[PDB]
Amino acid sequence: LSIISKYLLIASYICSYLEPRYDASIFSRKTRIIQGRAAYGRRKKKEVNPRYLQPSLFAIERLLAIFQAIFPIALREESLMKANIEVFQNLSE
Amino acid sequence: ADAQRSHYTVYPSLPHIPFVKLLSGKESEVNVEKRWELYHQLHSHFHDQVDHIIDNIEADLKAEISDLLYSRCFNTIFLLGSDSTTKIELKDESSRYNVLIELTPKESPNVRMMLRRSMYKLYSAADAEENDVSYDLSLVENFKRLFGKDLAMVFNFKDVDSINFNTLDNFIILLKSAFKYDHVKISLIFNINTNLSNIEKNLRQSTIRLLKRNYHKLDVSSNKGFKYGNQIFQSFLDTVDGKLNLSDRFVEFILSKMANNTNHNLQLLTKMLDYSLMSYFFQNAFSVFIDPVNVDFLNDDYLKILSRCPTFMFFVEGLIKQHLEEFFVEFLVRENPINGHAKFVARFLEEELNITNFNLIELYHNLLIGKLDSYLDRWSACKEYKDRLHFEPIDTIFQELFTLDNRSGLLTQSIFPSYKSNIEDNLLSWEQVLPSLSGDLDKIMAPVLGQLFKLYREANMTINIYDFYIAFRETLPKEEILNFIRKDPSNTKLLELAETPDAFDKVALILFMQAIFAFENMGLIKFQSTKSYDLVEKCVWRGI
Amino acid sequence: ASSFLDTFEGYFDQRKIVRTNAKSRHTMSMAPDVTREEFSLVSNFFNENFQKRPRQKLFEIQKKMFPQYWFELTQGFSLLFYGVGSKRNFLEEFAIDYLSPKIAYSQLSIPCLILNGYNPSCNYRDVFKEITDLLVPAELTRSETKYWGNHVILQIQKMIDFYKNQPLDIKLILVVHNLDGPSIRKNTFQTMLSFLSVIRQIAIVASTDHIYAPLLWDNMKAQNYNFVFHDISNFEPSTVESTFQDVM
Amino acid sequence: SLLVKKYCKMTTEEIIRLCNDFELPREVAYKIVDEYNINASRLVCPWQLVCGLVLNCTFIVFNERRRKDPRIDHFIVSKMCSLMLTSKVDDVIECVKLVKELIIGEKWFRDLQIRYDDFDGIRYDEIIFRKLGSMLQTTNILVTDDQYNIWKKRIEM
């Protein structure tokens, strides 16, 4: 597989085995201008071991958000990863 | 109305090349015709070698499949990284019929359909070479009694990763029952696109123990050892040798876009090279100067635009620090031997050092910048031959008038666009699309989709639709809208609706709702109900 | 309301939890009631009057792109047009008025089969029946029909192997308005057009509106399509495509 | 550094005198003041917001001489780090990239980009051919005609 397909699969496993509320604690690394509080993360460690169960269902935009959160990296360079046609081609593959 | 129909054929009326005139309309028609003919003679020269490479890789793949296939159990062959496009031809073994049976997951809804299609194919082939029977495995039992010869079945499973593995498993144990017949030989071919660990965990362990007795792996793809690719790239370089230059940014864009496609990277490489050649022969008026025949009509515009060159400016600055058309003609006879250097290095790697796993595109990249030594340090076998294999990249004046480059963003706009991001930047900005030149309304009032996308972007994940309508309504000037709606006096119902005191609350609402259903058609919004239309939630965020 | 707007920070930031004391339970009962006729009248007034001149200027700007489109079509690339706004008038004016008689003159008109993807009544069997009424291909033998196979796809696969060995002259102009429309986005229908797009003798001109439309095509389908992408944003009203989506 | 200290309170005189250091007209400085007054009570580091707003205004106001001379882009950002008490340059670049997305969709910024013809650095006649996929767009390979003329004047002088 390509690098885009492998990170899309990894992001798919993250989306299937994490809860959407805890995404703002793990991947958020941006400086804030408008005042706001980041998510605190999960309060207590649960013992379910979610990898033993069937995966949960997620949307496309959460997949692409986590994919560009975990993808490898002056005023025109655009550090983050855009969801162009080859990311969607790899997802269709 | 044919626009209210599904499909309609029309025949246009009629009362010739797509190349346009360059040099701001000053270029002659003979230069346009010459540029057309030169593009076609390079294009055909490249694609003939592409056709010979495609025929050779198909023929070699057929040869190695036959060699593995012919060298009380199955003969199993796992073609790894196979896109299920190979034509597997079988030899005519004497006194025995060899039958190919191909199976698609669409052709495999259950085991019964698999057997019925296989046995119909077997009976059709056997009758086509040499009363009807039941399309069933008893035909394999009585094959020698009905045809005299014995049988060799080769099963080719197209796209095994998409098949139901329970159905395939039960078909394998069903085919295992034909081992008790003395005249039957069965071979299986599995076209695997992921890897073998995915397919060994979906079959049962008895099936794996059955398939282990005679099996061969064969990893055949396009990325296997870079051979086929480098041949296409060398064919392109031999097409443009002596006339055109490849930029390092162009080669690194080829490497980056070919890294993101694994199964079909070859025709992607052909596509990018094709579009680069199309771009060069559509843009540059100096494309006719790649052969020495057409150097007899260089006009004042050619000399004007070849004087705006960084290499020429560096050269004349060096001459005025130390100390025109004939001098420009003088830079055409030179060789630029970097292509011959690259093919010599490739031959030295291939048949002296027995090194095949090298990427000639990345080698050409390191030759273009000049980091060949860091690329050759990895093999630990060119330690004493590095100085002879290294040559300095020569700098030639007016190279950038004969150059496939990537600086404008054209090749990443037509072939690999940021489609979703392009939609988002068109919707958010909107003055970069529409020209800034209803004469008063266009300077103060936004288009409804662009005005709606701002409040779309600055709201939250779930949006109440009436407050979103109110926030749309506060952004619109009611007096100028009512003045513009009274501009045409020839429509009576518009004038009788405008003087009604709630006219603006009708107008803004219906423009809002046509923009809302436009957003629903594009897929930006959705409704969190089926019977209600009171709350929307958004699915599209900018920048992702 | 949020610290981040774009990227994944904005996506995770705008997915907070909202308390029931700020529920914003307003409804469409508190709206000025409209029916079909006044909505249609004032809507068509704003479509035909509001920002008509700079849309026409942009349209005349993108008329100059047409020789590049024809050059892309003669080299085997299929055209896909995207952008905000409708693209029906663009494709009908480019394919019929410009591309068809100039392709007919360059090979000395070419028929244009036009598909309405906004219509849910579009069906691949009837469209392929019209295709076979135009191209008149060789009919499938008994051995080529296999065992309850899709006769449309098998006959296109016969046509591909036939048309490899023909002169590379464009016999048919195929226009697909709204390739991502509701009935037309299905996998069988996209397989049929990708297999038609392998044939060099058919020029493929298509448009799209959904922002997730590159998800429709895998590597095989994108290879068979062989697209050159063109951003044409014009803010057209989409008058005809809205007729299959009751806006009331 | 001024980019690190939080919860600062400012006067209008400081903003309008910092705007006149980079030679801005009055209405652009007034729009900078109003964009600060809208987000007054919902702000963490006001120095970053003011720095990035006066930056994103002075690339647009001074785009044509930046096309004339590139090192002015290295001159305005050098003047900023000499005033914001910041040693490195990348913090200012991350600051302007962070504040760019806050004013991109607004009417006054769109009107500024229309009036001074910035459109992220290029004219409308160039950007409408770059987004259309026109291959006849002006590539960044050859120098401009005005640059060639001023170079030939420099040679002849």
Side-chain angles (χ1 to χ4, degrees):
Chain A
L1 282 72
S2 54
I3 194 78
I4 290 180
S5 291
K6 281 166 179 191
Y7 276 94
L8 273 167
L9 207 45
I10 279 153
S12 309
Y13 205 93
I14 292 174
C15 282
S16 286
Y17 289 103
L18 277 296
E19 292 88 2
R21 50 199 181 227
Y22 307 134
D23 284 328
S25 301
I26 305 179
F27 312 104
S28 292
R29 45 189 156 89
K30 224 176 164 164
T31 309
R32 293 181 184 271
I33 302 169
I34 300 305
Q35 63 183 357
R37 297 171 79 158
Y40 303 150
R42 66 183 81 215
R43 182 181 292 175
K44 62 97 175 179
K45 166 177 71 176
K46 56 169 182 38
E47 297 89 26
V48 179
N49 204 308
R51 283 82 58 84
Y52 297 153
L53 306 85
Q54 293 179 356
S56 169
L57 296 161
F58 58 92
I60 281 295
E61 193 88 354
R62 187 195 170 196
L63 182 62
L64 299 172
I66 283 184
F67 172 79
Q68 66 172 175
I70 69 169
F71 202 68
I73 296 94
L75 280 83
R76 278 89 170 177
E77 56 90 20
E78 288 293 325
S79 300
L80 262 190
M81 176 78 165
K82 307 188 148 171
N84 69 330
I85 65 150
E86 56 181 16
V87 174
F88 286 93
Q89 194 178 157
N90 277 297
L91 187 48
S92 311
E93 193 44 53
Chain B
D2 45 27
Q4 218 60 67
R5 207 156 61 237
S6 296
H7 56 290
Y8 71 96
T9 304
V10 65
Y11 291 89
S13 298
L14 72 164
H16 295 138
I17 54 172
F19 272 12
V20 302
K21 294 181 176 67
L22 302 168
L23 286 174
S24 307
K26 207 61 181 65
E27 199 189 21
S28 176
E29 63 269 13
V30 59
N31 305 1
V32 173
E33 294 293 328
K34 281 299 292 183
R35 193 173 67 246
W36 184 245
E37 294 293 328
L38 267 68
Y39 163 70
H40 280 283
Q41 67 182 357
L42 288 181
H43 173 274
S44 300
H45 182 236
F46 173 53
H47 289 88
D48 285 318
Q49 312 175 237
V50 175
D51 295 346
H52 173 83
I53 289 163
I54 292 310
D55 282 295
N56 291 350
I57 62 170
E58 290 172 352
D60 299 8
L61 183 62
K62 291 177 70 68
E64 53 209 353
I65 280 166
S66 164
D67 189 279
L68 265 188
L69 194 63
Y70 295 99
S71 181
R72 256 49 173 161
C73 56
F74 299 114
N75 180 30
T76 311
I77 294 175
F78 299 101
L79 304 181
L80 275 64
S82 162
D83 49 354
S84 303
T85 42
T86 318
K87 295 301 291 182
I88 295 166
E89 200 272 336
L90 306 187
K91 295 186 289 293
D92 300 2
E93 314 307 336
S94 178
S95 303
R96 153 147 43 93
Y97 192 24
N98 289 73
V99 185
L100 183 63
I101 300 146
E102 319 197 287
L103 286 172
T104 300
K106 175 79 92 181
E107 277 161 5
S108 310
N110 46 70
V111 192
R112 184 202 172 242
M113 275 328 280
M114 274 176 105
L115 179 78
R116 285 182 64 79
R117 285 186 165 101
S118 310
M119 291 295 85
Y120 174 70
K121 182 69 204 176
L122 170 64
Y123 203 60
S124 297
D127 180 66
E129 205 186 23
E130 284 101 15
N131 199 1
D132 60 296
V133 300
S134 179
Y135 293 140
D136 191 52
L137 207 64
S138 62
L139 168 66
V140 176
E141 199 194 31
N142 299 309
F143 198 87
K144 188 165 277 296
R145 295 179 66 250
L146 293 178
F147 293 97
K149 294 181 176 67
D150 49 347
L151 185 58
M153 311 199 264
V154 176
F155 280 87
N156 190 21
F157 301 100
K158 308 311 206 52
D159 291 331
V160 193
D161 291 331
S162 191
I163 210 174
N164 198 272
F165 273 96
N166 186 56
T167 296
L168 179 71
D169 203 357
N170 300 329
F171 191 68
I172 289 163
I173 295 89
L174 186 137
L175 280 188
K176 185 187 144 186
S177 288
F179 293 152
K180 71 222 181 203
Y181 306 135
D182 189 74
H183 55 262
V184 180
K185 185 183 286 185
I186 303 173
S187 300
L188 309 184
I189 299 175
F190 293 101
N191 293 279
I192 313 298
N193 267 312
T194 50
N195 71 129
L196 187 153
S197 69
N198 286 1
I199 70 165
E200 66 183 1
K201 295 317 287 283
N202 284 270
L203 298 190
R204 283 176 294 185
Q205 268 278 8
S206 60
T207 309
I208 300 298
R209 283 193 299 269
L210 172 69
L211 290 180
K212 194 190 176 301
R213 307 173 190 171
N214 190 31
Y215 79 103
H216 310 257
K217 308 165 97 190
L218 190 73
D219 48 354
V220 286
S221 296
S222 67
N223 263 316
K224 183 220 170 61
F226 304 92
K227 185 184 155 171
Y228 299 163
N230 303 333
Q231 288 177 333
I232 289 167
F233 195 79
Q234 190 61 71
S235 292
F236 188 75
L237 292 168
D238 291 331
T239 310
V240 301
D241 208 16
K243 41 193 67 63
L244 284 188
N245 290 318
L246 264 71
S247 280
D248 50 321
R249 326 266 190 101
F250 178 54
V251 175
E252 83 189 341
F253 178 97
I254 288 172
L255 292 165
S256 179
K257 295 300 178 174
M258 186 156 144
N260 300 341
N261 202 296
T262 58
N263 189 359
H264 301 256
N265 59 341
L266 287 202
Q267 282 198 342
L268 193 74
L269 166 66
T270 314
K271 169 177 198 183
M272 302 178 270
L273 294 173
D274 280 6
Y275 205 79
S276 179
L277 194 69
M278 293 177 70
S279 297
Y280 181 74
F281 273 91
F282 208 77
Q283 292 174 1
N284 189 359
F286 283 94
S287 296
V288 298
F289 287 94
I290 67 169
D291 49 329
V293 190
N294 313 312
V295 299
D296 298 333
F297 42 80
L298 72 165
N299 290 117
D300 60 329
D301 295 0
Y302 288 106
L303 274 298
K304 183 250 185 181
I305 67 168
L306 70 91
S307 295
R308 299 193 286 105
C309 292
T311 58
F312 175 72
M313 183 277 288
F314 291 166
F315 184 79
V316 302
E317 270 179 353
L319 271 295
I320 66 150
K321 282 297 190 296
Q322 291 147 50
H323 182 268
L324 184 53
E325 56 181 3
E326 179 61 90
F327 198 60
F328 179 67
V329 169
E330 199 263 331
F331 291 103
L332 191 149
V333 71
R334 313 168 167 212
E335 178 71 30
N336 191 359
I338 186 168
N339 311 272
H341 196 241
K343 71 183 181 181
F344 163 68
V345 164
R347 184 176 177 86
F348 199 73
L349 258 58
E350 207 266 347
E351 62 93 17
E352 272 83 358
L353 277 296
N354 205 359
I355 293 293
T356 76
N357 204 58
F358 60 95
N359 198 7
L360 183 63
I361 313 178
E362 212 271 322
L363 187 139
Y364 208 93
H365 188 241
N366 294 131
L367 211 55
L368 272 175
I369 294 92
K371 266 74 176 175
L372 176 73
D373 48 312
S374 67
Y375 176 60
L376 293 184
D377 276 334
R378 288 196 293 116
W379 281 284
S380 178
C382 296
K383 307 247 183 200
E384 61 263 59
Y385 314 116
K386 62 96 175 179
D387 281 321
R388 191 169 58 85
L389 264 48
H390 169 73
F391 190 72
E392 202 71 31
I394 191 67
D395 203 4
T396 303
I397 296 99
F398 313 110
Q399 57 93 25
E400 69 275 16
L401 294 174
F402 310 99
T403 285
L404 312 176
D405 210 321
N406 193 3
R407 311 204 59 173
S408 61
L410 159 75
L411 197 79
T412 187
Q413 183 62 255
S414 314
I415 314 296
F416 317 96
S418 71
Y419 172 96
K420 178 174 181 291
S421 174
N422 276 321
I423 297 303
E424 291 160 351
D425 305 310
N426 290 321
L427 271 175
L428 184 64
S429 297
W430 79 256
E431 70 274 15
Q432 308 174 338
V433 184
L434 273 194
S436 67
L437 60 85
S438 66
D440 49 354
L441 203 67
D442 304 345
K443 290 193 286 184
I444 50 174
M445 183 177 176
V448 298
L449 300 170
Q451 183 62 255
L452 203 60
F453 187 73
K454 181 266 290 180
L455 295 148
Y456 176 90
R457 177 160 170 270
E458 294 182 55
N460 282 108
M461 183 278 288
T462 50
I463 308 159
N464 182 276
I465 194 170
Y466 178 55
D467 283 325
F468 191 66
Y469 157 67
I470 289 174
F472 182 76
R473 204 178 69 196
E474 297 295 323
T475 44
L476 263 53
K478 54 185 296 294
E479 296 297 321
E480 293 290 328
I481 275 172
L482 285 172
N483 209 328
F484 157 73
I485 209 170
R486 265 186 218 109
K487 191 65 74 176
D488 198 4
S490 280
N491 208 348
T492 307
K493 275 87 70 177
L494 278 177
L495 299 181
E496 86 183 337
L497 188 151
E499 290 181 354
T500 314
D502 64 333
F504 178 65
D505 299 335
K506 297 292 188 197
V507 161
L509 181 61
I510 62 172
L511 295 181
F512 170 77
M513 294 299 291
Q514 76 161 350
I516 281 297
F517 287 85
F519 274 29
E520 182 65 26
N521 212 6
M522 305 175 62
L524 311 176
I525 62 170
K526 67 184 288 184
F527 292 99
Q528 187 61 256
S529 176
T530 318
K531 275 85 66 179
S532 172
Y533 296 82
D534 269 357
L535 307 173
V536 298
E537 41 168 35
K538 57 183 179 181
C539 307
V540 170
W541 271 260
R542 193 183 183 253
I544 313 189
Chain C
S2 160
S3 55
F4 323 109
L5 279 185
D6 317 297
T7 72
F8 64 94
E9 293 83 3
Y11 173 71
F12 297 142
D13 200 22
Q14 288 180 354
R15 290 175 92 84
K16 289 182 191 297
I17 50 171
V18 182
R19 298 298 175 195
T20 76
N21 306 75
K23 55 187 301 184
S24 297
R25 41 157 180 86
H26 285 352
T27 177
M28 271 309 105
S29 295
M30 294 182 286
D33 196 285
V34 286
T35 186
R36 200 257 181 194
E37 46 263 18
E38 52 250 33
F39 158 71
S40 297
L41 171 81
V42 190
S43 74
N44 286 119
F45 176 73
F46 284 95
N47 310 120
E48 298 208 331
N49 289 269
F50 174 53
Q51 287 178 175
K52 194 68 186 323
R53 186 193 209 71
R55 275 185 266 141
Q56 278 151 330
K57 182 67 181 294
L58 182 49
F59 182 76
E60 292 298 305
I61 284 180
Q62 63 201 7
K63 298 298 293 295
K64 322 167 74 63
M65 282 288 317
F66 283 15
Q68 179 181 330
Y69 296 156
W70 171 21
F71 181 42
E72 279 148 355
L73 276 172
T74 60
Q75 294 319 291
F77 294 91
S78 301
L79 299 186
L80 186 148
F81 296 100
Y82 65 99
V84 60
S86 161
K87 292 154 283 286
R88 184 172 174 91
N89 292 331
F90 191 95
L91 271 68
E92 300 268 46
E93 205 274 329
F94 159 71
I96 297 169
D97 301 331
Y98 182 85
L99 181 86
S100 170
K102 292 177 71 68
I103 286 188
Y105 279 152
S106 63
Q107 305 173 144
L108 271 180
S109 79
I110 319 295
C112 294
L113 180 51
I114 297 142
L115 275 72
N116 289 339
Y118 52 92
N119 196 356
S121 296
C122 202
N123 185 54
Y124 71 95
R125 311 198 158 271
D126 283 287
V127 168
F128 185 61
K129 184 178 184 293
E130 182 65 26
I131 284 279
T132 47
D133 282 313
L134 283 148
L135 303 173
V136 57
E139 176 281 345
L140 279 172
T141 74
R142 184 171 174 83
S143 179
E144 281 166 333
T145 43
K146 309 196 304 169
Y147 202 87
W148 267 264
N150 199 314
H151 281 210
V152 167
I153 307 298
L154 293 172
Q155 184 177 2
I156 299 156
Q157 285 170 273
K158 182 140 162 291
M159 268 196 289
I160 286 157
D161 301 317
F162 168 73
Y163 274 123
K164 294 181 176 67
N165 294 320
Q166 294 306 120
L168 277 65
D169 306 358
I170 284 181
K171 289 126 196 12
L172 175 60
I173 301 299
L174 194 64
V175 174
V176 186
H177 292 113
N178 271 269
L179 186 63
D180 45 1
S183 184
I184 199 152
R185 57 185 74 170
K186 299 292 180 68
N187 191 302
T188 312
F189 214 145
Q190 297 286 329
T191 310
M192 170 182 100
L193 288 180
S194 304
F195 276 11
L196 286 159
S197 303
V198 186
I199 301 158
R200 273 292 289 279
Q201 287 79 359
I202 311 167
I204 319 291
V205 176
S207 76
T208 183
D209 273 333
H210 206 274
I211 202 163
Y212 282 173
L215 190 59
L216 283 181
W217 315 295
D218 82 359
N219 289 33
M220 185 90 260
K221 282 213 190 64
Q223 194 197 260
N224 285 5
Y225 276 150
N226 188 243
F227 278 141
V228 166
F229 293 86
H230 285 301
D231 175 32
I232 55 169
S233 290
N234 45 15
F235 302 92
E236 294 293 328
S238 176
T239 312
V240 176
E241 296 93 0
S242 70
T243 53
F244 296 101
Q245 49 150 317
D246 173 284
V247 171
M248 295 298 102
Chain D
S1 176
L2 273 69
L3 305 179
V4 192
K5 56 185 292 293
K6 298 167 71 174
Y7 315 127
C8 170
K9 299 295 186 290
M10 293 180 183
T11 53
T12 316
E13 277 73 30
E14 170 67 31
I15 314 295
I16 66 181
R17 292 317 266 275
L18 195 144
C19 284
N20 283 122
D21 303 334
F22 300 95
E23 288 96 11
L24 282 72
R26 288 309 289 272
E27 287 187 353
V28 185
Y30 287 153
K31 258 70 178 175
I32 288 175
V33 162
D34 298 320
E35 204 66 38
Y36 185 83
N37 279 48
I38 292 308
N39 293 318
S41 65
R42 207 178 65 248
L43 183 54
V44 177
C45 294
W47 274 114
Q48 293 179 356
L49 185 70
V50 176
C51 165
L53 262 63
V54 303
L55 274 170
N56 274 322
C57 288
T58 188
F59 305 87
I60 299 177
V61 168
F62 276 24
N63 46 349
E64 69 275 16
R65 205 179 55 208
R66 199 167 64 256
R67 286 186 197 116
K68 292 277 194 180
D69 211 317
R71 59 91 173 174
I72 320 184
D73 209 338
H74 296 168
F75 185 46
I76 304 301
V77 74
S78 81
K79 198 177 178 179
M80 185 64 72
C81 310
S82 298
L83 188 151
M84 295 299 291
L85 273 299
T86 302
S87 178
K88 63 179 70 65
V89 186
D90 190 74
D91 282 331
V92 191
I93 311 299
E94 290 281 326
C95 172
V96 69
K97 269 204 169 203
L98 197 60
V99 305
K100 182 138 147 172
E101 297 319 344
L102 277 296
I103 63 171
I104 178 164
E106 269 77 2
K107 186 181 289 293
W108 72 271
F109 193 67
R110 151 170 83 247
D111 288 314
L112 183 63
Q113 290 177 312
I114 283 169
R115 194 182 175 269
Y116 261 72
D117 216 349
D118 187 38
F119 302 150
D120 186 352
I122 48 171
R123 281 75 178 272
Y124 173 75
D125 199 3
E126 291 182 354
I127 203 167
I128 198 50
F129 284 162
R130 293 180 66 188
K131 293 187 287 184
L132 273 182
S134 191
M135 60 185 72
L136 306 171
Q137 67 187 249
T138 61
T139 183
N140 209 338
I141 278 160
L142 295 192
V143 294
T144 53
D145 178 87
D146 195 12
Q147 217 172 36
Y148 177 58
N149 283 118
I150 65 176
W151 170 87
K152 204 162 185 176
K153 291 291 116 174
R154 203 263 306 162
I155 290 296
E156 273 157 350
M157 287 296 107

